[PDB]
Every structure is written in C-alpha cells, then in structure tokens.
Amino acid sequence: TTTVGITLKDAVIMATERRVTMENFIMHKNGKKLFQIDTYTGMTIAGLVGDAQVLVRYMKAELELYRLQRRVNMPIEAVATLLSNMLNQVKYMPYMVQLLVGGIDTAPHVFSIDAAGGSVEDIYASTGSGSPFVYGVLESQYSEKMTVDEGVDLVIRAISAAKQRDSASGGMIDVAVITRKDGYVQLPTDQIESRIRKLGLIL
C-alpha cells in the first residue's frame, strides 16, 4: 500500500500503487488508492481497506457540501484539520488508516494525518508499507526547484523502487497533479507507462 505526495511551485503531485494484501496472499492486483476529494484536492488512503474507503466517502461528501453552498473550495489545511478532528474524536476506536491530503488553495500543500488525528504539513510524505523506500529515494532525489514533469518522474522512480522491496505494494502506478490552473488531473495509464519504459523498469 505505497503512496506519496510532493509539493512544488504552484503544483502538487500524489502517486500511489494499487495492491490489496492479506499476508503472503494478494486479493487484488488492482484496487483504488488515489482519489480526488475536491476540485483542487486529493487524498491517498493506506492501511485498512474498509475504514479508508468509508473515510473517502465521508470526505468527498463533506467537501462537496461546503463547495456547493459556499461556492469556494475548502482550504487544504482546514481539510486536514477536519480529518484530524474526525480521527481523534474516536482515537480509542480508530481507523486502521493513514491518509494524505494534498491540493492547492492559495499555495500547494500536503498533509499526513495518522490514526490519532494529528495532521502535519510537510514537503513530501510517503504513507504505506513501502514508504521507507520512497523516503529513501526522495532524501536523495527531491528538490524544491523541480519541474512539473520532473516531479511526475521522481514520484514514479520511488514507488517503482518501493515495489522492489515491499511485498505489499504492486500493480500499476496511479499518479495525479493539482495545478492552480488545471486543478486535479489524473494522468492517463499509457502516459505513465511511457515514463516507466524510459527509466528501465518492468510491471
């Protein structure tokens, strides 16, 4: 269940993988892990299936409500704070989840929220069984300057090395990009493969 979310200049990328495990067993080689939760916001579930999904819905619904009646997206921080609160209000009967809230309001943000409700903003954040790897690559390949496309590559180079050690992550590599201009925009499968083949990976 490897996912990540990096910031940049007027942009935010969020890429996951899509495998659902159960020990030395693989139920689905293709599930969903990256969703658009609002016009300029995304989210990456990671951990317990059920909980995660229920959250996404509990979310997508609430962001939309606000947006529909207030005519303005909700600040990326208030979104993480909302999620924060929800998770802590029942920290003793938690959600075996771990999500990432990324998007752009006035600036490109990225939040990592835990089963406790503690949400902390950072430059990049990798949630998932194979994140220690993504955190390995990134601590030796990420740079604030990077181009909108250099980013989409970096993210991939990570989840692609992660998929090389984390028995729990696999499948395709869904990626998306939030630009103040184009808003949330998921990349086409083919386009992702293009990136792959060039680097030198297989799957």
Closest CA to 199 of 166, 165, 152: 152
> Contact between 8 and a second copy (CB under 8 A)?
no
Does 39 participate in catalysis according to the annotation? Answer: no
Q: For residue 198, how many other CB atoms are within 10 A of its CB?
A: 9
To a second copy, the closest distance from the beta carbon of 25 in angstroms equals 7
Three-state SS at 79:
helix
Rank residues 60 and 157 by Cβ distance to another protein and give the closer one: 60
> Contact between 82 and a second copy (CB under 8 A)?
no
> Contact between 84 and a second copy (CB under 8 A)?
yes
Residue type, 197: R
Closest CA to 131 of 101, 96, 163: 163
> Contact between 122 and a second copy (CB under 8 A)?
yes
> Contact between 172 and a second copy (CB under 8 A)?
no
Cβ-in-10-Å burial (0-12, 13-18, 19+) of 90 comes to exposed
DSSP H helical ranges for 42-163: 49-70, 76-88, 131-138, 148-162
Residue 77 interacts with, from a second copy, another protein, none (CB under 5-8 Å by kind): another protein
Binding pattern to a second copy, positions 129-158, x when CB under 8 A?
A: ---x--------------------------
> Contact between 61 and another protein (CB under 8 A)?
yes
Among residues 1, 7, 16, 127, the one annotated as catalytic is 1
Residue 150 interacts with, from another protein, a second copy, none (CB under 5-8 Å by kind): none
The token duo for 176 is 């998306």
Residue 47 interacts with, from a second copy, another protein, none (CB under 5-8 Å by kind): none
Rank residues 121 and 153 by Cβ distance to another protein and give the closer one: 121
Q: Give the span between the Cα atoms of 174 and 31, in whole angstroms.
A: 10
> Contact between 107 and a second copy (CB under 8 A)?
no
Strand-pairing partners, residue 113, are 99, 119
The token duo for 129 is 């069984």
Residue 172 interacts with, from a second copy, another protein, none (CB under 5-8 Å by kind): none
